[PDB]
């Protein structure tokens, strides 16, 4: 795919879907910044892999649920590269229980760490992308955020709020060509029963949806939610 | 409308949409419980207005965002009336501001107040209504939670999260006939009215009647739905 | 429920969900006009049952897919009645098959009969309700129109078209206080399927009928262009 | 973007959005079949321009609303190329008028011509793509099929029916790996006012959204309605 931008920051990218987004975007020629919070071994391993395939990769440590930490990280990337073309808000956790077994503590943890991180990222994207009249931001949402689930009142709250907040951000960034969109993965690798495509999704399929929404090919799409769930939910 | 249930708790019912919801359900024979946080001047005045007109009304206290406070009023109401049929999560604030001028303080205040509160309400509705195999909960969301708005990242996050959480709760309470539903009002009382097909602002009372429908027996097969009351502003 | 308006025409009302809308609206004091197409007997039995129960009811024969018949029937009701306050486009057919087995014949029949009929209904409603600045029209759609279904390309086409056309009609009727809304029933009783319904049961026809009543009644005076899901959680 | 398949038919592709879709899919390596009904001038001009630019391109004459005539066209393509990997139902007309002024003739014309044609395309796609267990179909709908518009009861009916029928076809084709998806463009080159991106859309951005949905990058996406409207509707 074709990118006018040059670099991308991916929160929570040391493993899983975030790692695969990093891998996909770096194989398409963007310099990927791979966020991690705790142990650096796995992030450093991914960065080494990506350079060793010939790509551009750097690692950066911050807590995406911390305002100061994540503002200073974006400032450091601006100072190293000259700007920031792309952001992927992927940082997220799960703490599933039935609601009657869930303290407001278990709710606040998931809400803060899944929504406020995305809010910080989107606001800082608005700041650093405005001067150049160019940017794209993708919020990794979920199918749970669109339909809800048993035992996932907190998670579904966070990712439905992410879907609606992202549209608000699209409204605010659209006049300076700063686009915001959500991706709602389905089941990514019994549950396979209800999937019409009769298989789990690969992380790469998510990653290439993200790549499309960051790319120039989606330059008229903003404020949209892209389902990547094999037909589980239309 | 027809109600098998007997009483309702309405958070933030002292004025505006909450109070006129309260008037509405009282007029249809339900015992209303106005909930307030600060002054009891308007809440008491409402309560009295509702009892002169011949209706059953009382008041109760908590910060609907406070877990303990919320819970403990719900036991108080169960002990007074023998149960709680209906709940309306109406409590909510706005703190509008462009996102770049918005401290995460201003974001947490709105999230914690507007959606954690609805979480305590819904989770406790599940608890008190499960025994009796009957219940109906309506969460008062907004068109902003469906479409988003400039200057309302915090409010749209809270209300959209409510709308989705409501669906999860509907899942958890469906097997026991506890129904969960949301209402998304539009602009409720000139350039604003240009984009409303009905060409007018909504009365707080139209929102209240939609809430009554979702609480009544007439919606007994409707759970997990989001009912748009916006005069056509959003379809 | 409260109704400012006085009478209602329900298309396809001689049996099933339409008969239950007629029964429910009759019991709320509306004069119901029960439409039928072919054999009257079942329709006149419904009219007699409603009149015995103390309610107002009449029958009227016309083909909802025929522009002239449906025009002329609405004109007749306006002249018996003084006007027409409420309309329920309930007429619909199914011809389920897989698409590779479906002729275009089998597609137009369901389209011409499920959508065009609603189009005529809503357009005549606009006409006859404009002067009095009051009116409410409900279009009986389906969950299939929202979600799509195997073997139901034609039916889902017709009901999704109905759902979107109903919103356009809301736009055109909104200035004369003529509201347009849709109901999307799920699986209604007439047990593999009850699996995927959270409420763990089929719906009753009366639950649909009461949702229709709400969308006709005064209580929904600010709700227009909406699609009200009656499916017990099968689709959110 | 990559494509496992080799060719694509596009109905109503002689000018406008369909021409741009032909132009875009041609530059990415697909052999494009340019459908037209009436004059062949403009379609030959398109063909000659794409063959000038080094690409494979062929015109084909048929009325998309006629069952026999678009079944036969698909059959002739199958015989020439050996198969058909991709289809784009783009044929479409408007006859805008207030509902009280609109004969059922006016309604039937737009219905028969916008929605029946897509039905004939999607069934025939089911038939010809099933054996190879590979295919992708994109139905070009509209924002009007999602929110409605005054004066456009007929167009909105056709396009919203297209959007729901496409999910039904997605269900039917899922097991064979034949994907169905819709595109809902907004305003495509006062009005601009209500568009957050503050400009009309290029046919070119619609065409690239279509390309993504046909491509291998959307291989876990079926039954989706991808909005291309610059924030005009979220
Ligand atoms: N897999 C699915 O089916 C599915 C579908 C829907 C969406 N997604 C989304 O996919 C994303 C991650 O994919 P995954 O399921 O493969 O999860 P995963 O394997 O847990 O990867 C999540 C990553 O995000 C990190 N993270 C969490 N909070 C963070 C913070 N505040 N700052 C920085 N990094 C943070 C992780 O925590 P640690 O430091 O603890 O490793 C981890 O590296 C999330 O947004 C999830 O909500 C998942
Ligand atoms: N009006 C609209 O256009 C619109 C549309 C969408 C939905 N709604 C919803 O309508 C509801 C209220 O209607 P309104 O707009 O008319 O607002 P309002 O006039 O401000 O009434 C809101 C009430 O909720 C109370 N409240 C706030 N937080 C509370 C808490 N934690 N515990 C208990 N009570 C609390 C208020 O606070 P005080 O103690 O500070 O008075 C006040 O009595 C909200 O949920 C809002 O989100 C508004
Ligand atoms: N049952 C469900 O699960 C379900 C769910 C979604 C919505 N609905 C909708 O419910 C409505 C009817 O309910 P039902 O399922 O109980 O169907 P039903 O039992 O078949 O009742 C349908 C009625 O509509 C009549 N009708 C058909 N075309 C007509 C026309 N052109 N003019 C006048 N009447 C016409 C019937 O035809 P005859 O003269 O041939 O009897 C019959 O009386 C339809 O709109 C259907 O599309 C059904
Ligand atoms: N432009 C927009 O703002 C917008 C937005 C939403 C979607 N779209 C969709 O985009 C498509 C067309 O793009 P456009 O707006 O640029 O329209 P256009 O300029 O009119 O191009 C439409 C083409 O489709 C052809 N066509 C119509 N019916 C046909 C049939 N039965 N068989 C074969 N070809 C047929 C045309 O007819 P002739 O032979 O009469 O030339 C013409 O070549 C349609 O599906 C329209 O509904 C338009």
PDB file of C-alpha atoms in Angstrom, chain D residues 48-163:
ATOM      1  CA  UNK D  48      -8.148   2.597 -25.480  1.00  0.00           C
ATOM      2  CA  UNK D  49      -6.874   4.817 -22.679  1.00  0.00           C
ATOM      3  CA  UNK D  50      -6.221   1.801 -20.431  1.00  0.00           C
ATOM      4  CA  UNK D  51      -4.585  -0.302 -23.114  1.00  0.00           C
ATOM      5  CA  UNK D  52      -2.588   2.874 -23.892  1.00  0.00           C
ATOM      6  CA  UNK D  53      -1.327   2.897 -20.290  1.00  0.00           C
ATOM      7  CA  UNK D  54      -0.022  -0.664 -20.749  1.00  0.00           C
ATOM      8  CA  UNK D  55      -3.092  -2.457 -19.375  1.00  0.00           C
ATOM      9  CA  UNK D  56      -5.475  -5.266 -20.331  1.00  0.00           C
ATOM     10  CA  UNK D  57      -9.013  -3.992 -20.840  1.00  0.00           C
ATOM     11  CA  UNK D  58     -12.049  -5.082 -22.800  1.00  0.00           C
ATOM     12  CA  UNK D  59     -15.481  -3.586 -23.363  1.00  0.00           C
ATOM     13  CA  UNK D  60     -18.728  -5.545 -23.117  1.00  0.00           C
ATOM     14  CA  UNK D  61     -22.251  -4.435 -23.982  1.00  0.00           C
ATOM     15  CA  UNK D  62     -25.211  -5.505 -21.895  1.00  0.00           C
ATOM     16  CA  UNK D  63     -28.133  -4.134 -19.907  1.00  0.00           C
ATOM     17  CA  UNK D  64     -27.414  -4.951 -16.253  1.00  0.00           C
ATOM     18  CA  UNK D  65     -31.122  -4.931 -15.408  1.00  0.00           C
ATOM     19  CA  UNK D  66     -31.828  -7.731 -17.943  1.00  0.00           C
ATOM     20  CA  UNK D  67     -31.373 -11.248 -16.561  1.00  0.00           C
ATOM     21  CA  UNK D  68     -30.637 -13.100 -19.818  1.00  0.00           C
ATOM     22  CA  UNK D  69     -28.346 -10.376 -21.146  1.00  0.00           C
ATOM     23  CA  UNK D  70     -26.130 -10.045 -18.091  1.00  0.00           C
ATOM     24  CA  UNK D  71     -26.127 -13.833 -17.508  1.00  0.00           C
ATOM     25  CA  UNK D  72     -24.874 -14.292 -21.061  1.00  0.00           C
ATOM     26  CA  UNK D  73     -22.273 -11.554 -20.624  1.00  0.00           C
ATOM     27  CA  UNK D  74     -20.857 -13.339 -17.572  1.00  0.00           C
ATOM     28  CA  UNK D  75     -20.789 -16.591 -19.562  1.00  0.00           C
ATOM     29  CA  UNK D  76     -18.897 -14.997 -22.458  1.00  0.00           C
ATOM     30  CA  UNK D  77     -16.323 -13.574 -20.026  1.00  0.00           C
ATOM     31  CA  UNK D  78     -15.947 -17.012 -18.428  1.00  0.00           C
ATOM     32  CA  UNK D  79     -15.247 -18.499 -21.848  1.00  0.00           C
ATOM     33  CA  UNK D  80     -12.730 -15.808 -22.838  1.00  0.00           C
ATOM     34  CA  UNK D  81     -10.717 -15.631 -19.599  1.00  0.00           C
ATOM     35  CA  UNK D  82     -11.508 -19.032 -18.042  1.00  0.00           C
ATOM     36  CA  UNK D  83     -13.308 -17.488 -15.066  1.00  0.00           C
ATOM     37  CA  UNK D  84     -14.198 -14.305 -13.229  1.00  0.00           C
ATOM     38  CA  UNK D  85     -12.546 -13.432  -9.941  1.00  0.00           C
ATOM     39  CA  UNK D  86     -14.200 -10.110  -9.185  1.00  0.00           C
ATOM     40  CA  UNK D  87     -17.398  -8.181  -9.710  1.00  0.00           C
ATOM     41  CA  UNK D  88     -18.402  -4.585  -9.056  1.00  0.00           C
ATOM     42  CA  UNK D  89     -22.111  -3.765  -9.238  1.00  0.00           C
ATOM     43  CA  UNK D  90     -21.938  -0.074 -10.160  1.00  0.00           C
ATOM     44  CA  UNK D  91     -24.807   0.381 -12.630  1.00  0.00           C
ATOM     45  CA  UNK D  92     -27.126   3.020 -11.258  1.00  0.00           C
ATOM     46  CA  UNK D  93     -29.564   5.782 -12.166  1.00  0.00           C
ATOM     47  CA  UNK D  94     -31.335   8.567 -10.290  1.00  0.00           C
ATOM     48  CA  UNK D  95     -34.813  10.074 -10.880  1.00  0.00           C
ATOM     49  CA  UNK D  96     -35.138  12.473  -7.960  1.00  0.00           C
ATOM     50  CA  UNK D  97     -38.561  13.914  -7.245  1.00  0.00           C
ATOM     51  CA  UNK D  98     -40.817  14.638  -4.299  1.00  0.00           C
ATOM     52  CA  UNK D  99     -42.841  11.572  -3.345  1.00  0.00           C
ATOM     53  CA  UNK D 100     -46.262  13.132  -3.982  1.00  0.00           C
ATOM     54  CA  UNK D 101     -45.120  13.929  -7.543  1.00  0.00           C
ATOM     55  CA  UNK D 102     -43.700  10.446  -8.168  1.00  0.00           C
ATOM     56  CA  UNK D 103     -45.648   7.863 -10.149  1.00  0.00           C
ATOM     57  CA  UNK D 104     -45.017   4.230  -9.283  1.00  0.00           C
ATOM     58  CA  UNK D 105     -43.514   4.077 -12.768  1.00  0.00           C
ATOM     59  CA  UNK D 106     -40.857   6.512 -11.496  1.00  0.00           C
ATOM     60  CA  UNK D 107     -40.280   4.279  -8.442  1.00  0.00           C
ATOM     61  CA  UNK D 108     -40.244   0.956 -10.314  1.00  0.00           C
ATOM     62  CA  UNK D 109     -37.727   2.231 -12.878  1.00  0.00           C
ATOM     63  CA  UNK D 110     -35.094   3.135 -10.269  1.00  0.00           C
ATOM     64  CA  UNK D 111     -35.786   0.005  -8.205  1.00  0.00           C
ATOM     65  CA  UNK D 112     -35.599  -2.384 -11.170  1.00  0.00           C
ATOM     66  CA  UNK D 113     -32.552  -0.668 -12.501  1.00  0.00           C
ATOM     67  CA  UNK D 114     -30.514  -0.177  -9.308  1.00  0.00           C
ATOM     68  CA  UNK D 115     -31.384  -3.193  -7.161  1.00  0.00           C
ATOM     69  CA  UNK D 116     -32.380  -5.960  -9.572  1.00  0.00           C
ATOM     70  CA  UNK D 117     -29.145  -5.431 -11.535  1.00  0.00           C
ATOM     71  CA  UNK D 118     -27.122  -5.928  -8.357  1.00  0.00           C
ATOM     72  CA  UNK D 119     -29.140  -9.055  -7.626  1.00  0.00           C
ATOM     73  CA  UNK D 120     -28.381 -10.475 -11.097  1.00  0.00           C
ATOM     74  CA  UNK D 121     -24.697  -9.644 -10.596  1.00  0.00           C
ATOM     75  CA  UNK D 122     -24.378 -11.201  -7.141  1.00  0.00           C
ATOM     76  CA  UNK D 123     -26.237 -14.472  -7.991  1.00  0.00           C
ATOM     77  CA  UNK D 124     -24.200 -14.939 -11.186  1.00  0.00           C
ATOM     78  CA  UNK D 125     -21.072 -14.213  -9.130  1.00  0.00           C
ATOM     79  CA  UNK D 126     -22.162 -16.950  -6.711  1.00  0.00           C
ATOM     80  CA  UNK D 127     -22.499 -19.297  -9.669  1.00  0.00           C
ATOM     81  CA  UNK D 128     -19.204 -18.621 -11.428  1.00  0.00           C
ATOM     82  CA  UNK D 129     -16.972 -18.173  -8.367  1.00  0.00           C
ATOM     83  CA  UNK D 130     -18.138 -21.163  -6.338  1.00  0.00           C
ATOM     84  CA  UNK D 131     -16.075 -23.874  -8.049  1.00  0.00           C
ATOM     85  CA  UNK D 132     -12.755 -22.057  -7.583  1.00  0.00           C
ATOM     86  CA  UNK D 133     -13.663 -21.199  -3.971  1.00  0.00           C
ATOM     87  CA  UNK D 134     -12.497 -17.640  -4.530  1.00  0.00           C
ATOM     88  CA  UNK D 135     -14.152 -14.322  -5.294  1.00  0.00           C
ATOM     89  CA  UNK D 136     -14.975 -10.786  -4.248  1.00  0.00           C
ATOM     90  CA  UNK D 137     -17.941  -8.596  -5.075  1.00  0.00           C
ATOM     91  CA  UNK D 138     -18.432  -4.959  -4.206  1.00  0.00           C
ATOM     92  CA  UNK D 139     -21.760  -3.232  -4.477  1.00  0.00           C
ATOM     93  CA  UNK D 140     -21.558   0.514  -4.835  1.00  0.00           C
ATOM     94  CA  UNK D 141     -24.349   1.856  -2.674  1.00  0.00           C
ATOM     95  CA  UNK D 142     -24.759   5.344  -1.278  1.00  0.00           C
ATOM     96  CA  UNK D 143     -25.045   7.359   1.964  1.00  0.00           C
ATOM     97  CA  UNK D 144     -28.706   7.853   0.962  1.00  0.00           C
ATOM     98  CA  UNK D 145     -29.216   4.109   1.440  1.00  0.00           C
ATOM     99  CA  UNK D 146     -28.024   4.653   4.980  1.00  0.00           C
ATOM    100  CA  UNK D 147     -29.784   7.824   6.079  1.00  0.00           C
ATOM    101  CA  UNK D 148     -32.343   8.664   3.407  1.00  0.00           C
ATOM    102  CA  UNK D 149     -32.888  11.997   1.695  1.00  0.00           C
ATOM    103  CA  UNK D 150     -35.785  14.217   0.733  1.00  0.00           C
ATOM    104  CA  UNK D 151     -36.839  13.767  -2.881  1.00  0.00           C
ATOM    105  CA  UNK D 152     -35.068  10.380  -3.028  1.00  0.00           C
ATOM    106  CA  UNK D 153     -37.533   7.788  -1.704  1.00  0.00           C
ATOM    107  CA  UNK D 154     -36.870   5.630  -4.779  1.00  0.00           C
ATOM    108  CA  UNK D 155     -33.070   5.952  -4.854  1.00  0.00           C
ATOM    109  CA  UNK D 156     -32.816   5.433  -1.092  1.00  0.00           C
ATOM    110  CA  UNK D 157     -35.061   2.358  -1.281  1.00  0.00           C
ATOM    111  CA  UNK D 158     -32.904   0.833  -4.016  1.00  0.00           C
ATOM    112  CA  UNK D 159     -29.621   1.572  -2.260  1.00  0.00           C
ATOM    113  CA  UNK D 160     -30.681   0.448   1.242  1.00  0.00           C
ATOM    114  CA  UNK D 161     -32.096  -2.726  -0.258  1.00  0.00           C
ATOM    115  CA  UNK D 162     -28.750  -3.156  -2.003  1.00  0.00           C
ATOM    116  CA  UNK D 163     -26.966  -2.806   1.351  1.00  0.00           C
TER     117      UNK D 163
END
